[PDB]
Amino acid sequence: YRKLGRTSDQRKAMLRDLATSLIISERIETTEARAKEVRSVVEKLITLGKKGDLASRRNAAKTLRNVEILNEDETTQTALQKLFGEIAERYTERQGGYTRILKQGPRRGDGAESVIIELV
Amino acid sequence: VKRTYQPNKRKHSKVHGFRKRMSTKNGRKVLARRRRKGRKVLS
Amino acid sequence: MEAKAVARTIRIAPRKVRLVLDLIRGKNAAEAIAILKLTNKASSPVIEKVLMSALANAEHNYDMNTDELVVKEAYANEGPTLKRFRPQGRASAINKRTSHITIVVSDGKE
Amino acid sequence: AVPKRRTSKTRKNKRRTHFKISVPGMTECPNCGEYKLSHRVCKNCGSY
RNA sequence: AGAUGAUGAGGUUAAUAGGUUCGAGGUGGAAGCAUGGUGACAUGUGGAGCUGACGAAUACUAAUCGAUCGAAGACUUAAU
RNA sequence: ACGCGAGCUGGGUUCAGAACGUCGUGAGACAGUUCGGUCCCUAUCCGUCGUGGGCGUAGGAAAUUUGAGAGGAGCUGUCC
RNA sequence: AUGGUAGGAGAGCGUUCUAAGGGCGUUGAAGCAUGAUCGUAAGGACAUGUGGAGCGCUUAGAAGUGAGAAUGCCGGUGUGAGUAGCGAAAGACGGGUGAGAAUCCCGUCCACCGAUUGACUAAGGUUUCCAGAGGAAGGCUCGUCCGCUCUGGGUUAGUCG
RNA sequence: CCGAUAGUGAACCAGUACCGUGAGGGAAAGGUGAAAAGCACCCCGGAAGGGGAGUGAAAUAGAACCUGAAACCGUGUGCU
RNA sequence: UUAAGUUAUUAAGGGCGCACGGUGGAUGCCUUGGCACUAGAAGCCGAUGAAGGACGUUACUAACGACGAUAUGCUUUGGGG
Questions:
Q1: Into which family does the record put it (chain A) (predicted)?
Q2: Which nucleotides of chain F does any protein CB come within 7 A of?
């Protein structure tokens, strides 16, 4: 597997916060590998919330941070509620994938082979 | 570490200073020289 | 036929930039711009800026066709190096270089 | 562990022959777009 | 396979990787129920439940557009 | 270069402290011992181990190969 | 007759200045560069471009008079080498600004210190302070930011000291 | 007698910047044009910088501004 | 057509000549400044407050210089134009 030249605890925390924010936006801009490896993660989170069982609910609350989207009309819910109430249905038929990715150009500060990631 | 020059204003003005160097003939000798060089500054 | 443009005393080393310039020697203004917009250095966009003004000259002033325009020649040469310092607990210093960029573009004719 | 003699310029340039930079691809967009690199988002005059 | 680059396997007519599904293997009996138990705890539901690199399968996701290079069989002589 | 410290240690030297014995008017010496006491370097050339790039083999490419030579290998012991 | 070191004797080549004489020179001096010219040598002329003002020739006089080296001095330049290095602390996303963003702002989450990297008072430092404007220069990368620059403001005591 | 590595340390910002606890030590740095007439206006540029235009006898005389060597760095090139 | 033989064709890069540029600041020319001298003055000030200075004063104005609440100067005459 890949390490990111970063420590394990920082790494895990980064990935989970990543997928959180991702769920908020439905797409984001970042680098390549960080996307490559939040890929499988959030695919598995979808594979969970496709079921809605309380066990999976519990298993997901491990990874999802404790966050509040203010949805439209002054309506609020969490990433969890969103996942188990809005998104499972969407790919309820599908058997893999669930995301896609978009190569882009380098950044200025670096040779950052950056990428957008989104849902499919 | 400690290096030198832990300053004190008053001490500077004491071992140096106008009223200091003007007490002694061997003090007053130099002001002439600083004035002789036209060194801008005294004490 | 030809037009000039020149960047005076640019805060880059000639060796930093001579390579990004050693490609478009002999090419067209069109492909060259693309190359400049693809290479991920910091010399590139500057050179692009220069090129755009060069052809602004060649058009507004001499009014030649912006498609049969090849790169006639392009280089850069040294400039007025300046100097700065380095703490190290005791004296030390280094130089910041510069560059004189020159690009001439022709309609490949007389 | 330092220089004994000087670097002659010939020898320098000889060494830095392979010190270069190659190029990008830069195809057209027959799929959708203007002249732009193959199989790619609009990077410059492109759609696909 | 590998510092890099070289090597190799693949590039939609596609199983290359991922995901999904299954499996293997490993761990050791999930939760929730129910019962027992004053309690800690225990039993059953249940070799359960989980499972990164491994294996199969599935084109669900992406390797699609496309570009560049690339020869024109020399002479001499003896055979032919 | 009593093979090798720009590959390792420094146990001993030899450094400045100190003790003992002897000699020395003494300052000090001996060696007679004793305890303790700071080992720098981003590898330019050749060289070496590996790795690529370039070009050439009178047509161009793919694959398989002969091998001029080069390197490597030869230690013992035991029961019947 | 003519190898030749210390060394001895001699002959000279040029540079700066002065006197005299005689001259050249915006029709382009001096310097500068080129050049296939002359001289046994020190060296000298000529033409050719730049150059845009003073300079040679002859004679004699006088000298801070001739440089490759002194681990020489002063300045510029390289080489090494695109090498070595880029000094302590967990960040991620979005949104924004904007010519221009990893490095600025805003938000959320996370993380760290935790008898403290916290708060006070001093010493010491002296306007680094705040409000705007600025990329030119500085910032060890960047930079729309700044303890950088500019402009304009800013420190109030009978009890504090 | 020297003409900005000279001449005094000092031809300008000089006993100054700067250094030094302190006495004390102590630099660097001259030249647009006759006249500023110091590039009106256009184009590119975020700007800087430019190219034109324009002034000037001249702007490869454009304020860091007289000539502008050499080291050094570059682009082309004929022969290899 | 096959042999046997000779021979090219490449410059990634480099070198040698030529030209064109850049940097940099020698050289040339010049002086604003100085050095050593000549002759003649003079040699030396202050408790009535010295030298030397600090704070200030000016349109802007930065320093330098001038002068000091009469503060980038006042009265005065003689010249002055």
A1: Belongs to the bacterial ribosomal protein bL17 family.
A2: 6-7, 41-45, 52-53
